Amino acid sequence: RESLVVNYEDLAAREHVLAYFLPEAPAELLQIFDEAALEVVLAMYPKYDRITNHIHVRISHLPLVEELRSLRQLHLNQLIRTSGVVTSCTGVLPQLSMVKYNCNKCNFVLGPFCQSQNQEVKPGSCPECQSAGPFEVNMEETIYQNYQRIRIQESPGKVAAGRLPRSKDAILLADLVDSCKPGDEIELTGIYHNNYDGSLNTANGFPVFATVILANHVAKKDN
DNA sequence: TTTTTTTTTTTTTTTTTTTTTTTTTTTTTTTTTTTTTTTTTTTTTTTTT
Numbered sequence: 080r081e082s083l084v085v086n087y088e089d090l091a092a093r094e095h096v097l098a099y100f101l102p103e104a105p106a107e108l109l110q111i112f113d114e115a116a117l118e119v120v121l122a123m124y125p126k127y128d129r130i131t132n133h134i135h136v137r138i139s140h141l142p143l144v145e146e147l148r149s150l151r152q153l154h155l156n157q158l159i160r161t162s163g164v165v166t167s168c169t170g171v172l173p174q175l176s177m178v179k180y181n182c183n184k185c186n187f188v189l190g191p192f193c194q195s196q197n198q199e200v201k202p203g204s205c206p207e208c209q210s211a212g213p214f215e216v217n218m219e220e221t222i223y224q225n226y227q228r229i230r231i232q233e234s235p236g237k238v239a240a241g242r243l244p245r246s247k248d249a250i251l252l253a254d255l256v257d258s259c260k261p262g263d264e265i266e267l268t269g270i271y272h273n274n275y276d277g278s279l280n281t282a283n284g285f286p287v288f289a290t291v292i293l294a295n296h297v298a299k300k301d302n
Numbered sequence: 303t304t305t306t307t308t309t310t311t312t313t314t315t316t317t318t319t320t321t322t323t324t325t326t327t328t329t330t331t332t333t334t335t336t337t338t339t340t341t342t343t344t345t346t347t348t349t350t351t
């Protein structure tokens with residue numbers, strides 16, 4: 080299952096310093112948690128390392144829940160809990176995860192590069208023939224991960240008298256995909272994320288930033 | 303006219319500079335085209351007393 084759900088209540092109990100740090104810097108703290116859990120699991124099941132070589136630490140019951148309309152730039156790069164209704168949901172897409180390239184000048188397979196969520200990986204030279212020239216994804220030696228983009232609006236009951244429901248895009252990755260269906264009311268925990276390529280720099284108008292939530296944890300509220 | 307020292311002076315290169323020649327080289331935007339909606343202007347089947 081490659082997914083380890085850690086409650087926040089008991090993490091704030093046992094180790095409150097981490098629980099203070101985690102909302103402020105969730106990317107790094109979550110990377111640390113993932114690697115620590117991975118090696119704990121390898122200690123417990125040494126054979127298990129052939130399976131997925133990565134443990135996803137999900138975090139539950141994060142105390143303070145901000146609703147979709149109250150999200151601000153104060154919340155940028157922070158772990159938030161919202162709640163809403165899934166309105167749209169792409170199919171599971173295959174996203175480059177550890178991507179190998181072909182130098183199509185000498186056919187050398189450029190070594191595995193980690194694909195981050197906020198920047199297109201582009202190699203420099205190839206290490207053999209030193210061509211800056213064109214590369215192509217080697218799709219046989221690349222590994223991918225499941226990617227899904229959902230849209231979540233505010234619950235219509237939770238919307239005030241004269242006001243429209245606001246919606247956000249969230250990104251489900253690799254173990255979270257297909258956990259939501261349109262019309263589901265979910266509790267979404269994730270990083271309120273700004274900095275990938277969403278900035279209206281293209282003279283279309285104001286220099287505003289589009290925002291997404293890197294989902295960390297999805298709780299479906301139903302039977 | 304036999305012996306003998308300066309003299310080049312042609313041949314090896316080497317330096318060595320100055321000049322001309324050689325070698326190298328994808329990415330990123332934009333745009334047309336196609337296929338869609340969508341409000342509006344008709345126009346073609348519906349029925350009555």
Ligand SMILES: [Zn+2]
Nearest residue numbers: 182185205208
């Ligand atoms: Zn090459």
